[PDB]
Design an enzyme around this catalytic site. Structure first.
Site, mmCIF file in Angstrom:
data_model
loop_
_atom_site.group_PDB
_atom_site.id
_atom_site.type_symbol
_atom_site.label_atom_id
_atom_site.label_comp_id
_atom_site.label_asym_id
_atom_site.label_seq_id
_atom_site.Cartn_x
_atom_site.Cartn_y
_atom_site.Cartn_z
ATOM 1 N N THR A 162 9.247 -10.243 5.884
ATOM 2 C CA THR A 162 10.294 -10.217 6.941
ATOM 3 C C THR A 162 10.097 -11.459 7.810
ATOM 4 O O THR A 162 8.999 -11.595 8.401
ATOM 5 C CB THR A 162 10.246 -8.926 7.776
ATOM 6 O OG1 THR A 162 11.377 -8.878 8.649
ATOM 7 C CG2 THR A 162 8.981 -8.793 8.599
ATOM 8 N N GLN A 188 -16.208 -1.157 -7.089
ATOM 9 C CA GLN A 188 -15.113 -0.153 -7.236
ATOM 10 C C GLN A 188 -15.418 0.721 -8.462
ATOM 11 O O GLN A 188 -15.060 1.883 -8.460
ATOM 12 C CB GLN A 188 -13.743 -0.821 -7.388
ATOM 13 C CG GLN A 188 -12.577 0.162 -7.359
ATOM 14 C CD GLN A 188 -11.258 -0.533 -7.135
ATOM 15 O OE1 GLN A 188 -11.197 -1.629 -6.586
ATOM 16 N NE2 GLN A 188 -10.192 0.085 -7.599
ATOM 17 N N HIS A 237 0.843 -1.221 0.000
ATOM 18 C CA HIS A 237 0.000 0.000 0.000
ATOM 19 C C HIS A 237 0.865 1.252 0.000
ATOM 20 O O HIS A 237 0.365 2.316 -0.366
ATOM 21 C CB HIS A 237 -0.894 0.012 1.245
ATOM 22 C CG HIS A 237 -1.742 -1.196 1.382
ATOM 23 N ND1 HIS A 237 -1.506 -2.164 2.334
ATOM 24 C CD2 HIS A 237 -2.846 -1.581 0.685
ATOM 25 C CE1 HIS A 237 -2.417 -3.108 2.223
ATOM 26 N NE2 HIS A 237 -3.263 -2.777 1.195
ATOM 27 N N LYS A 260 9.693 -12.664 -3.502
ATOM 28 C CA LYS A 260 8.575 -11.794 -3.042
ATOM 29 C C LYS A 260 9.158 -10.593 -2.272
ATOM 30 O O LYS A 260 10.024 -10.781 -1.376
ATOM 31 C CB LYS A 260 7.556 -12.594 -2.226
ATOM 32 C CG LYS A 260 6.276 -11.849 -1.843
ATOM 33 C CD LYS A 260 5.847 -10.734 -2.802
ATOM 34 C CE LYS A 260 4.434 -10.877 -3.341
ATOM 35 N NZ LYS A 260 3.406 -10.338 -2.414
HETATM 36 N N1 LIG Z 1 -9.477 -2.760 -4.642
HETATM 37 C C1 LIG Z 1 -8.400 -2.058 -3.931
HETATM 38 C C2 LIG Z 1 -8.958 -1.259 -2.742
HETATM 39 C C3 LIG Z 1 -9.935 -0.139 -3.036
HETATM 40 C C4 LIG Z 1 -10.843 0.243 -2.064
HETATM 41 C C5 LIG Z 1 -11.724 1.288 -2.253
HETATM 42 C C6 LIG Z 1 -11.681 1.987 -3.424
HETATM 43 O O1 LIG Z 1 -12.570 3.106 -3.554
HETATM 44 S S1 LIG Z 1 -13.924 3.000 -4.477
HETATM 45 O O2 LIG Z 1 -14.647 4.191 -4.055
HETATM 46 O O3 LIG Z 1 -13.385 2.992 -5.817
HETATM 47 O O4 LIG Z 1 -14.513 1.758 -4.079
HETATM 48 C C7 LIG Z 1 -10.797 1.658 -4.427
HETATM 49 C C8 LIG Z 1 -9.906 0.608 -4.209
HETATM 50 C C9 LIG Z 1 -7.402 -3.097 -3.415
HETATM 51 O O5 LIG Z 1 -7.736 -4.267 -3.233
HETATM 52 O O6 LIG Z 1 -6.264 -2.743 -3.144
#
Ligand SMILES: N[C@@H](Cc1ccc(OS(=O)(=O)O)cc1)C(=O)O
Ligand SMILES: N[C@@H](Cc1ccc(OS(=O)(=O)O)cc1)C(=O)O
Ligand code: NA
Ligand code: NA
Ligand code: NA
Ligand code: NA
Lengths: 318, 318
Positions: A235, A175, A47, A231
């Site tokens: 750790t 999403q 992330h 990968k």
């Molecule tokens: N699918 C992504 C996480 C994610 C969560 C919320 C998001 O906002 S939305 O308003 O588009 O739903 C977008 C992406 C992951 O698994 O990393």
């Protein structure tokens, strides 16, 4: 040119329409977003690149929006995963949402005038939505023929015992609708994410066009890979968490120190705010010094201070 | 023996577990159901055999539930359909439900104590159901691998210009969940429908076992064909409606008069409450009379009075 500056750091995997987006960024401030799902009580290094890209955009005068997946975290993103994710309880997901919301805060500026950061919870898009409203108003726009061809889920559609639930198959629509909602309600025109999110981002672009006839854009950052193909971001057999109660500042710092020479100059570009010129000069000094490289020390110092501040860095070095 | 007597009349296409169902029917009255979707402001001849079978079960001492698709009519059943259907507005579907409920009612006895007919509306199962609740609590039980292999939809999944919406793809879960609800609310253990409904029925049998651990059953009635291979229940390139304002009693009656000799004796079995032996004796009569057949006349007289009453039969002959 912000896209060209990010390309110099290797931070652009794919853009939906690079010339149109570069023209839009050149016109002045935009709002952009990245989502984060509560799959654990912490984010990890997977992330971190997109989170730092929100800050890079904010530094260039754009308005970053961090979306925490209150709704999507109850469903599970199948994108390039072999097996179904655990369905978590509403109570557990809600507790992880609050922990992740606090974790993103230090990386963005919530008090800097017009381009001040926004935090949103996509629960807000779905909590009042009836199943029949979703299936009709959103579902009518999705071709199952196209969904079964998205690279993100193709591996799930070979064998029934290695298959996918209707639950996770629907995630792409959630999403997709999230982008349309953030465009309509917050004026967001760009979504960023790791390259695994390409298909979820383009569903949002297409749905925003269908629902609102607004033009929006996608840009993906690379998934982090090592020269040796092992990968990245493990750790002692587990994830490198951003939470110091999960991965100590010491273990976090030692993870960076142990970076391979082949990976260290790329990682400085991905995970730090050092200029390309400073990183290039460090590479040369390490190449033409005769001593052991110091790049690893700099990377460990820079990233440890970013994620855990001076207090965490002194704790790691004590 | 009920299943046996239905088979004698040609009214049984498939049974999911004939031995276990015949056993349940022999023990005592069961509750069964058949669904009708508000695709129009009237049912047509494609609905008549399932409706008369609901009537036959009640006459045999079982409790029929007539389900009108207040929710499912908002989504649309793709089963063995070449093309995506048009959506209807909620206010239109609401009106059409009330019209279909009124059309179905006269066919069943709502006033015979224990085995009194029930009118149900599947809107009640989904009216208060949030999208995330549906995707989680129902959707986690459905494999997309198994769904795309259902005969009812697999041929919509070749090419996107012949494709299927997420909306219509979802229909199978709604009907699946309907069976489960009717099982828990009314003790329903049997769903009947046209042979096109087999896959929708079996998803409800499977879902009922998963949610309630109750064994329930399916029985399909044939799609009515002409010996000449052409489409049954079309007059002048249109449908034969059960609504006398849509298809006049005269046109309805003339549809039956114009029945092929190869169809009429089979249609007397499907559509009337004459004994097999009486229909066989009528077949004999028309065979070796020298005169014109009486069978098309008997069929037109019986079915017009069944569907449009004495008033309808009198209007058909004027
Ligand atoms: N699918 C992504 C996480 C994610 C969560 C919320 C998001 O906002 S939305 O308003 O588009 O739903 C977008 C992406 C992951 O698994 O990393
Ligand atoms: N799919 C059927 C109509 C239908 C309608 C409602 C039903 O009840 S439910 O409780 O299972 O939803 C069942 C079947 C057709 O197209 O004829
Ligand atoms: Na630009
Ligand atoms: Na899941
Ligand atoms: Na439809
Ligand atoms: Na099937």
């Amino acid at each position: 040119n912000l896209i060209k500056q990010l390309q110099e750091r290797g931070l652009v995997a794919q853009v939906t329409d690079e010339e149109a987006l570069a023209e839009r960024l050149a016109q002045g401030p935009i709002a952009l977003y990245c989502g984060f799902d509560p799959t654990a009580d912490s984010l990890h290094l997977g992330h971190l690149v997109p989170l730092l890209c929100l800050k890079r955009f904010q530094q260039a005068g754009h308005k970053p929006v961090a979306v925490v997946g209150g709704a999507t975290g109850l469903i599970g993103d199948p994108s390039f995963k072999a097996a179904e994710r655990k369905l978590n309880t509403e109570e557990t997901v809600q507790e992880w949402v609050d922990k992740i919301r606090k974790q993103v805060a230090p990386f963005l500026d919530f008090d800097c005038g017009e381009n001040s950061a926004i935090a949103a919870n996509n629960y807000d898009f779905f909590g009042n939505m009836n199943v029949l409203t979703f299936l009709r108003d959103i579902g009518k726009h999705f071709s199952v023929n196209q969904m079964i061809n998205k690279e993100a889920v193709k591996q799930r559609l070979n064998r029934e015992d290695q298959g996918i639930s209707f639950t996770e198959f629907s995630y792409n629509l959630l999403q997709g609708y999230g982008f349309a909602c953030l465009n309509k309600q917050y004026g967001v025109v760009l979504q960023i994410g790791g390259s695994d999110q390409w298909g979820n981002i383009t569903s949002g672009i297409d749905l925003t066009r269908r629902l609102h006839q607004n033009q929006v854009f996608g840009l993906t950052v690379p998934l982090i890979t090592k020269a040796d193909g092992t990968k990245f971001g493990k750790t002692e057999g587990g994830a490198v968490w951003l939470d110091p109660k999960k991965t100590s500042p010491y273990k976090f710092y030692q993870f960076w120190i142990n970076t391979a020479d082949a990976d260290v100059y790329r990682f400085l570009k991905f995970f730090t705010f050092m200029s390309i010129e400073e990183i290039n000069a460090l590479e040369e000094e390490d190449k033409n010094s005769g001593k052991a490289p110091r790049a690893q020390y700099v990377l460990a110092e820079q990233v440890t201070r970013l994620v855990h501040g001076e207090e965490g860095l002194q704790a790691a070095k004590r």
